[PDB]
Amino acid sequence: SMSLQVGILGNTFANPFMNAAGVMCSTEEELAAMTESTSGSLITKSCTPARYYTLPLGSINSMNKGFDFYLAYSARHHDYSRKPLFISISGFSAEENAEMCKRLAPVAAEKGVILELNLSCPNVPGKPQVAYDFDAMRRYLAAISEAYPHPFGVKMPPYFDFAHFDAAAEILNQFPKVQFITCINSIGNGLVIDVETESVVIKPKQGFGGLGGRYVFPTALANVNAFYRRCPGKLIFGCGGVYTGEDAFLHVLAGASMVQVGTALHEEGAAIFERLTAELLDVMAKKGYKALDEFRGKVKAM
Amino acid sequence: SMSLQVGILGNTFANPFMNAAGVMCSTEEELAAMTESTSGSLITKSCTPALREGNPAPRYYTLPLGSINSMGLPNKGFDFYLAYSARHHDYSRKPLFISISGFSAEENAEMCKRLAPVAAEKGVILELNLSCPNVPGKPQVAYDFDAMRRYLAAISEAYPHPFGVKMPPYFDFAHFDAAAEILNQFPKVQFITCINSIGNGLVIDVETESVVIKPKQGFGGLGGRYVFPTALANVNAFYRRCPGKLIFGCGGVYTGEDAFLHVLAGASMVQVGTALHEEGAAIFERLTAELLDVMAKKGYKALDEFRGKVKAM
Ligand SMILES: Cc1cc2nc3c(=O)[nH]c(=O)nc-3n(C[C@H](O)[C@H](O)[C@H](O)COP(=O)(O)O)c2cc1C
Ligand SMILES: Cc1cc2nc3c(=O)[nH]c(=O)nc-3n(C[C@H](O)[C@H](O)[C@H](O)COP(=O)(O)O)c2cc1C
Ligand SMILES: *[C@@H](c1cccc(O)c1)C1C(=O)NC(=O)NC1=O
Ligand SMILES: *[C@@H](c1cccc(O)c1)C1C(=O)NC(=O)NC1=O
Numbered sequence A: 001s002m003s004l005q006v007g008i009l010g011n012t013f014a015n016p017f018m019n020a021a022g023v024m025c026s027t028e029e030e031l032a033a034m035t036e037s038t039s040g041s042l043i044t045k046s047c048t049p050a051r052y053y054t055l056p057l058g059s060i061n062s063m064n065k066g067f068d069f070y071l072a073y074s075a076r077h078h079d080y081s082r083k084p085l086f087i088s089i090s091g092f093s094a095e096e097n098a099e100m101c102k103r104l105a106p107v108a109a110e111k112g113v114i115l116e117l118n119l120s121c122p123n124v125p126g127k128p129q130v131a132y133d134f135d136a137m138r139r140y141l142a143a144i145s146e147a148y149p150h151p152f153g154v155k156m157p158p159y160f161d162f163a164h165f166d167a168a169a170e171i172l173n174q175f176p177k178v179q180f181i182t183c184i185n186s187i188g189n190g191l192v193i194d195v196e197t198e199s200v201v202i203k204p205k206q207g208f209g210g211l212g213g214r215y216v217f218p219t220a221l222a223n224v225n226a227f228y229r230r231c232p233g234k235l236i237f238g239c240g241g242v243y244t245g246e247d248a249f250l251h252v253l254a255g256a257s258m259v260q261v262g263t264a265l266h267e268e269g270a271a272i273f274e275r276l277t278a279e280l281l282d283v284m285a286k287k288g289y290k291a292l293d294e295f296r297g298k299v300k301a302m
Numbered sequence B: 001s002m003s004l005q006v007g008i009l010g011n012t013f014a015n016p017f018m019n020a021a022g023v024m025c026s027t028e029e030e031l032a033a034m035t036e037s038t039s040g041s042l043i044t045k046s047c048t049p050a051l052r053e054g055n056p057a058p059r060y061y062t063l064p065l066g067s068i069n070s071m072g073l074p075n076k077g078f079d080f081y082l083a084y085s086a087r088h089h090d091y092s093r094k095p096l097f098i099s100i101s102g103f104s105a106e107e108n109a110e111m112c113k114r115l116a117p118v119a120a121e122k123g124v125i126l127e128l129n130l131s132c133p134n135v136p137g138k139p140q141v142a143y144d145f146d147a148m149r150r151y152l153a154a155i156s157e158a159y160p161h162p163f164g165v166k167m168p169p170y171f172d173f174a175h176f177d178a179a180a181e182i183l184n185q186f187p188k189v190q191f192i193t194c195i196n197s198i199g200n201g202l203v204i205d206v207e208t209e210s211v212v213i214k215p216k217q218g219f220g221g222l223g224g225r226y227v228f229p230t231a232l233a234n235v236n237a238f239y240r241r242c243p244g245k246l247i248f249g250c251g252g253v254y255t256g257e258d259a260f261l262h263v264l265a266g267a268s269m270v271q272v273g274t275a276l277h278e279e280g281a282a283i284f285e286r287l288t289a290e291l292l293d294v295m296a297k298k299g300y301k302a303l304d305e306f307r308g309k310v311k312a313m
Helices: A028-036 A065-077 A094-110 A134-147 A161-170 A214-230 A245-254 A263-268 A272-289 B028-036 B076-088 B104-120 B143-159 B172-185 B225-241 B256-267 B274-280 B281-300
Strands: A007-008 A011-013 A015-020 A052-055 A058-060 A085-089 A114-118 A152-157 A178-183 A187-191 A208-214 A237-239 A256-261 B006-008 B011-013 B017-019 B060-063 B065-071 B096-100 B126-127 B163-166 B189-194 B197-203 B219-224 B248-249 B265-272
Touching: A007 A114, A007 A256, A007 B172, A015 A272, A015 B219, A015 B248, A028 A065, A052 A245, A052 B096, A058 A214, A058 A263, A065 A085, A065 A094, A065 B225, A085 A094, A094 A134, A114 B060, A152 A237, A152 B281, A161 A187, A161 A214, A178 A214, A178 A256, A187 A214, A187 A245, A208 A214, A214 A237, A214 B197, A214 B225, A237 A245, A245 A256, A245 A272, A256 A272, A256 B172, A263 A272, B006 B197, B017 B225, B028 B076, B065 B274, B076 B096, B076 B104, B096 B104, B104 B126, B104 B143, B143 B172, B163 B248, B172 B225, B189 B225, B189 B265, B197 B225, B219 B225, B219 B274, B225 B248, B256 B281, B265 B281, B274 B281
Parallel strands: A015 A256, A085 A114, A114 A152, A152 A178, A178 A237, A237 A256, B017 B265, B096 B126, B126 B163, B163 B189, B189 B248, B248 B265
Antiparallel strands: A007 A011, A052 A058, A058 A208, A187 A208, B006 B011, B060 B065, B065 B219, B197 B219
């Protein structure tokens, strides 16, 4: 009757849900829990070649086992009969990312793991989000496209004006290997102070860190839709502020193919996926929808 | 004993609270209500040289944790706010700020030339809006550092008095540093208001499957609880980088504890937008009481005992 299936990148995903990179995906036990859950997919922690605080309305963070570990997991330890796997990489240079992609390529070809390239980590000492520098963004994507023979996706930071949406999309549309865009990473460099101690709540970088959870939901929907509109030849994955199936429904209406869950999954654990699928199917049932293809991107004007 | 007084800009303010520009400050009745309130100050709606009727409605919507707006600069025009400052405002009640938001550097310079004698005679204080996120086809001016410098140079040439700037949020230290470096080169910039709304969010209603505000495909500026950690970050980042300037905090204030944290991050004044839209001007009685409660539990007698004194871990 109804289905949450999503048929993309050549795979049938059972439902659109997965963890957000960095949440519940660092240890063998966590990857196993994600694999055993009802999520449609899972992604690893952003890795490099070789901290968190719960807030009333979400989270702030300033946060790997190395690329070797997550490659070996993708190569020999992940059960692909359960669900597909994504791997996130966030090298410190175009070259570091490229050397990783060259080593990832035989594993992607043989097992099917899919690369998400992180251009938006807001916590790299002395180095702003890569995708806030459009010249650097273009060099990274050219370097990866030359080094990596396979399709990949990009994790984007939020933008806040149409001139930036336009410029980012114009660059991404020049790279046909970029088959998906994940909107969004955390809202960078927020600051939380505790009233009683009069002190910041995370230690690095004078307390500044990336925001997730309820704080980011309208920004996340805006970025999903902005890129859905400007990159019709690519898929958009939504990430940001998802706590319920209604939240996921709104991300799909904005354009999302997959829906990633970060802060809410950190708080609730992998059982959240059982609740999210039920809730989303319930919204669909009330509206008579039978498939996500019927309303993905179909947000209406007022 | 305890006190919320602020002594800045050659004025004495009874407490740090004021409305945020654009909230409860467009008509004479709203301005009189703000003046009759217990707020420490007030600011007018950002104005353009001529009156504007604004974007089509609905252009504001109440969210679970705040607001979204595409107001589109509806305002009675500069001549109306100038007349308010020159002839109607009771300065014995509290100091007044005037917000201006012309569509180019030259429009703002022309308004400043006419404002200058009124500022001199009456003492109204200029806040220049460099961050409106709802101008058709033109991004936040302060997201274009070359344009920002041009605006500050044009105003500085045209306007003899010190003034403040309403800034959009930034999200990385490279931008904090670039913005600060520019502001520190303009001696007439005496205060920096952090922040305007987080631009170009989007809200969709589950039932209608439609955007909830009409203009610009539903994209609009976010206020309220969504913006608080970003606001505090911006206040503190500029407080650290522009020690020669005052910082005014704006964003996410609903309680005296929220205000306390703005001040701890560096705020001299604290502006209230969405929460004031919702509660009305009695909010200022509650915010002062709550802020005094925080101070009493900590033994603070004056805001300078803790302003800017956020601690590391
Ligand atoms: C503790 C933590 C660690 C994260 N680590 C990563 C990471 O390694 N790579 C990445 O792309 N995003 C990382 N993120 C960002 C999330 O993937 C997600 O983009 C963000 O939290 C917004 O989603 P949410 O509102 O559901 O939390 C991290 C988020 C948190 C809270
Ligand atoms: C309806 C509305 C109208 C606004 N109009 C202006 C404006 O004219 N000038 C300006 O500088 N900011 C304007 N703003 C932004 C507010 O001054 C403020 O920066 C923002 O709402 C964040 O504060 P808050 O979290 O308390 O709402 C407006 C905000 C709202 C909600
Ligand atoms: C950035 C990050 C990249 C690689 C490794 C690591 O530990 C972190 C990261 C991000 O992308 N998003 C976020 O919210 N927090 C981070 O630390
Ligand atoms: C921007 C605005 C620009 C020009 C004139 C005017 O009256 C307002 C405005 C802003 O600064 N902040 C906000 O949240 N909404 C807007 O529409």
